């Protein structure tokens, strides 16, 4: 449908840097780290995909 140009790459790199700082595990609560650990542990012990019990 086209015929403000494009954004400078430096600006798009700063948007990526902001998203990775907001989602960094090192900037989040410890509970989120534990949630990831539970998923990792579950997958090493599960009998099949979806086995949680």
């Amino acid at each position: 449908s086209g015929l403000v140009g494009i954004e400078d790459i430096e600006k798009l790199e700063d948007r990526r840097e902001a998203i990775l700082r907001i989602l960094s595990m090192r900037n989040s609560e410890n509970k989120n780290a534990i949630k990831m650990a539970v998923e990792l542990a579950r997958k090493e012990f599960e009998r099949f995909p979806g086995d949680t019990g």
Binding site: I9, L12, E13, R16
Partner: protein, 117 residues
């Protein structure tokens, strides 16, 4: 590797729209293995697994829906049911019980939508 996906995908889309072929592209043809630089190569570099899951889920839902409709219709019509069994290799299906024969129908409907596919 300081090179970033966004920057690399901004050179494969500018070189493909400007004609320039700096050696960076050849390197980029090795960083990603994308020997050919076309609009249908950046689309295959940025594919997300979620997209595949969305299609596998539609196929799964289709199979279940088809199996149920098929058996549902077959049971509604005893004549088409008796024929159905004979066509699939049942001997005198007429002389069978509801459960002893509905299982055959279920085993057949699931053998005509999962074996052929």
């Amino acid at each position: 590797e300081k090179t970033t996906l966004l920057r690399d995908i901004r050179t494969i889309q500018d070189a493909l729209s400007s004609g320039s072929t700096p050696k960076e592209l050849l390197e980029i043809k090795q960083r990603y293995g994308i020997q050919d630089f076309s609009q249908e190569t950046v689309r295959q570099l940025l594919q997300l697994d979620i997209s595949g899951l969305e299609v596998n889920l539609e196929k799964q839902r289709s199979l279940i829906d088809r199996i149920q409709t098929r058996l549902s219709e077959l049971l509604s019509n005893d004549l088409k049911c008796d024929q159905f069994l004979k066509d699939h290799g049942v001997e005198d299906p007429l002389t069978l019980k509801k459960n002893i024969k509905k299982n055959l129908l279920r085993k057949h409907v699931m053998m005509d939508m999962q074996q052929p596919s």
